[PDB]
């Protein structure tokens, strides 16, 4: 009843016309329901907002439809894009049937995960750093018929348009190749002005930014946002994606975060940077390995342990496993190395006492960031308590190594498809179930979501290529 | 190739004014290739010790540096080609290995010969008969795209649901279409292929196959011809014969044909239902009194197929598109059980069963497989059942498509594999029954798995699927 | 099937040079289905105990785990197919149940056989003669769209009044059209089908039917060919024979036909007028002096049909589109009464009545019905009337279309059901006259019921109608 | 409340719209829902079955007249069916003897002409008016719907 006080005056000052609550279902889809501002009261930011939770896969049945969304009054912001002054408020789903936060609400599973660390005493805060690579495209067509599957992404930069005629029969040239976006100047990079637009809008929504470049792939970009609390970071993951997409829309374009839209060029990742702190210290800083600690070396060993099951949350779509192909800055072998992008985890080279972190490179933004980040922690905490060796560091370009020497040398490796990684995750979920952080009911709801939403379609829908190879059998 | 077998061939050619001789052979994928000779150039020594060719052009076979191999002509089942504009005689060929000096251990017609011979040597029988129903589609068009920014296919047949509102010749649209899953088997004009189908049969007749049924099939532009059973190699030859004709009579009618298992999502798939019986001294050994007119021999055979099925499947369902077909509810099996009159099952025991018709039909193989291999492997697995009296279990006579995933997993029924990699895995974890008597060579199975992982699995896993842009582009 | 008719069938197929034997049979909808055998394959032993087939592909019949069934050939009214390019013979078949070991209780042709027999065994009569007037439309084009955001249909025909102002081949339009309701029966050029109707009649002559009238009918593109009556089963057979011929002669002339009941709003429908008489010992039992040349037997038979009509119409008007047709002002009956020379009644006593020609014309059925089931049902409805001496009321010699809304409900005439759901509920409420002598099994009345509810009513109750957007889109 | 044929294409199971005539709390599968938000002030019913093809003056009038009538005759509501009421099979519905919304406008117009007395209370709905409504809907919605062929029956029936 003070952040309420602070809130209800912050609205009077920006002339807030609508209160836009935003929540995240299990897929990570940020949803919004919005109220007329004069109808909002003190006694509804403690009562909560009713919604229908039966319209969300993995959540409520239709005979127990009504749930409460509960306002949480931090990191709210003024929508840059609405034409009538809206303010955006983060919410949790509260379960009016077990009278507790919703066991299938990710922003709660993340919250539950953030304090599990506190109550474990292993550390106080756990910081998350999310490089979210993206694409900005010109057009996006799809078809899913009985007789035809079909997609086509479009961008003027693309090698498919070197022979093409644009406005006057004209084609201004000046293109990055396949794998050529890193990092030419204009006019080759067409997207200088629009990315300084995003950042300026990201500054205005509360994220602290620091880098903006063009990425390797054809229409690819990246913004460095400053690391945050486990939850706070994923709040900012959702915020980022809203801004980028809506900046793309209003600039007459379409943007995506998906893992791998272009075959044969780089795919957007989610480079997660993690380090755990306590009593003003960075508990990964040490002297045991290249500026790292045994607590660190172990946190790592928990994530390299449950990685195959961890991909179920970290790499949550079939399209992710089109990214995990050797040869595109993306990872595959579950190992670690300093200064090395062909690894699953790179120690950043800029490593002083405060910066000491791991960069897990394997996630992409088809993960739900709350669940994704939640699960990178329980994995790590299981590393500390069970003091589990991370193995030996491999300072090799891992891609080049012949495929028979992976089985031969016995080194673990990312799963090749999603169905696989849902199966490792079900085969050992126990570290996820600590202190009912991830409940089993939710763990179940999750997979009867991802199989029905993702695995079973892929498995049953003819693939264009299957007609090159098999239609002449 | 006898010496009078040779002269009857020359005479046949002479009688028929053969201008060309067209040798044909199958590579591991199952593709049927040819190389043809001026008849005047053909001599009595070429049909005795071989035709030179370049075997490094076929994923699986030779490296560029030991590239030369030899085709050995087998003068059986040759025929005058119905479609060539100059009289030619198609002649079936084996590959000969001119380094190890022996029939090529990777030549799929050789493997089936070794298989059928393995059966004779062991004395379990003299002959394995195979019946193969090869369903096919006939389309009007097939568009494909495979670039970096796009993936795309489209079939077209005027019988198709998607054409109900379409305009054709004069803005005119004729009506009378079968529904999705409604082509079975209405009369014309809903059935727009009665003619091209009787064309097919008559030409199948010319090329040496005996026919009985022809009919329309469930899916929109789908068909089936019933051709009599041959021995293990003869049937696998007649499958290639069938596929050639159906693809050529479709082409000369300005149309295009596919034996791939699942060109349409939401409609019935195209199978190779294989019907099997093993015989010794002129008694069908499958005939008996144990279970619905079948014997303990027959049942054990069945035990081996089911036992080794998930490995077998890497040969009998030889493509990623094969698994799009193995999906509940299109008369395609998913559960590895057997039953009478039950199309929900893997193995169907048919109704009109007699001392002549004692058989099984195995409904899980498709035509994306190599017939020579998918058959040999069905035998190897099957004799492994006889030799070890492997037990099929008891028939499930339910609708298995109704069974829940929990209910299916709980009672712990074995199902088909869900992908081509898994069944390839399962097949490398279980090679022994194939390797009996050098029938399937260890070398060959390695080439086979390397070929298939590189030509089918890694494309699939690494090539974005369109429907992924529905589910994940807006994340 | 005696081995005599088997001798004469084979011998018939040698002199017409037959390459295929096209076996045919009708499902519960009435869709005529075929499956063809290479003639050289055909066997005496096969025409004795039958052809197997996949029975699970037919709504209402078997389920996939008892899918096998036997088609049993019936060597009557076979005929050379005019239309196929390679000589085929079309042969009718029944469905045999190989689980209950009996003619299939859900094969319409058997049920109709059970009806004709039941009349025999009942002693009421030796034979029941059925004459069927099968009106049709010949269109040029038919487009349909069945989507989430759209429902669409367009018929086209050059006769249609929607083309008076349109350009055809070279900016040109020949005029001379019948208007709405004008097709009866102006000479050419207005009548654009003198030659395609004569083609039909002739190809009906070839395939075995006696024809007499051929005319254009009242609606824009309509027509009717009179056929000499047959026995209950034979009349049903020739309804399938006719429908085939008419749909194929449309096809090969660049056109598309339909027996559907009401393809055009505001113009006449397509009816199937059923002419019916029952004889015994060579005398026409309908012949008498009780009313307009008919006997008591006749009237009471009629008493039966009208009593049970509301339920009967689920069997004789079998599609939601049947009920678009059953509305006043287009020569179809909505009012369940009888009258001599009145085309606005349900049943008409045609004028030229002799002792040989005493019959009733039941006018309410349409061709969307299953002819075997529709005729069986009428017979039962009428047998019930003979046995129970049901009185058909008196005659209604008026223009029944001129009867105002709350006036036909005043005088307590009952009228046809307004929707196919309502006809279905009536029939399940009055089954007992169908199951007499087990002619219509109960098991069968339930399959039919779920057949029609699922395949007609629920799609109608659930799919937005375009006209609903006129009335409610601005609500 | 559902004064159009279009109404009855919505009253179909599976689309968050009620077919079965019973009530339940937190249940979008029922005719009447009891909101969890149920204070001393906000105690209401959500009758989920109306739609905006009703004249809403007529609709709220007739809801009241029936809902009033309930009080005078102390009409018992039955037991709460707190089920996903879609999951009921057709036969389980008949055997359980469950009331259910009409499948057609024609039907509900008939069911209403057979049950009028509770609207004619204290002259609120006139016999005269009811009679004029009765014909207006019949001539303007039922008779069109029953006579204008439907696209779907050409898939179904053009090839009969
Ligand atoms: N005591 C009351 N009497 C009548 N109407 C009321 C009463 N209290 C609230 N209402 C009205 O009923 C409606 C309820 O809106 P509300 O937002 O509560 O919907 P809901 O059924 O909970 O659906 P959802 O879960 O989709 O938000 C509003 O129009 C509201 O003002
Ligand atoms: N101690 C830390 N804990 C967590 N994240 C950090 C820490 N230090 C930096 N980061 C974050 O790492 C992400 C990547 O920063 P960047 O300078 O791009 O590193 P790199 O050299 O790995 O590319 C940013 O979100 C950044 O704020
Ligand atoms: N004893 C037998 N062994 C192996 N195959 C057989 C035997 N008898 C028949 N067949 C074959 O079985 C296949 C199909 O049987 P079929 O009669 O077509 O079944 P259905 O028509 O019900 O699908 C054909 O290739 C046929 O020759
Ligand atoms: N005794 C009878 N029983 C049954 N049908 C008959 C009998 N006599 C004639 N029919 C048939 O009834 C139909 C009558 O045709 P028609 O006399 O042209 O009638 P309309 O002028 O109403 O078209 C024909 O199929 C004809 O064979
Ligand atoms: C009518 P049928 O017995 O031939 C079933 C064939 C099926 N499409 C399949 O996938 O094998």
Author numbering:
A (entry chain E): 9 to 481
B (entry chain I), C (entry chain H): 7 to 481
D (entry chain F): 322 to 481
Wording from the paper:
The GS in H. pylori (Hpy GS) is a critical enzyme that is involved in processing the ammonia released by urease activity, and nitrogen metabolism. GS is an enzyme involved in the biosynthetic reaction producing glutamine from the condensation of glutamate and ammonia. Although the structural and sequence information of Hpy GS indicate its relationship with GS I-β due to the presence of a specific 25-amino acid residues (residues 155–179), the adenylation site (NLYDLP) found in similar homologs is replaced in Hpy GS (NLF407KLT), suggesting a lack of the adenylation regulatory mechanism in Hpy GS.
Hpy GSsub was determined at 2.9 Å and refined to crystallographic Rwork and Rfree values of 16.45% and 24.27%, respectively. Among twelve subunits, PPT was not phosphorylated, resulting in a substrate-bound form with PPT and ATP in three subunits. In only one subunit, PPT was phosphorylated by ATP hydrolysis, resulting in an intermediate state with P3P and ADP. PPT was bound by six hydrogen bonds with Hpy GS (NP to E141 Oε1/G275 O, OTP to R331 Nε, OP to H279 Nε2/R331 NH2, and OεB to R369 NH2), and P3P was bound by seven hydrogen bonds, where the O13 atom additionally formed a hydrogen bond with R349 NH2. The possible ammonium binding site was blocked by the methyl group of P3P, acting as an inhibitor. In both the Hpy GSint and Hpy GSsub structures, one magnesium ion was identified in the n1 metal binding site. The side chain of E337 in the Hpy GSapo structure was disordered, demonstrating the flexibility of the Glu flap, whereas the side chain of E337 in the Hpy GSsub structure formed strong hydrogen bonds with the N274 Oδ1 and D60 Nδ2 of the adjacent subunit.
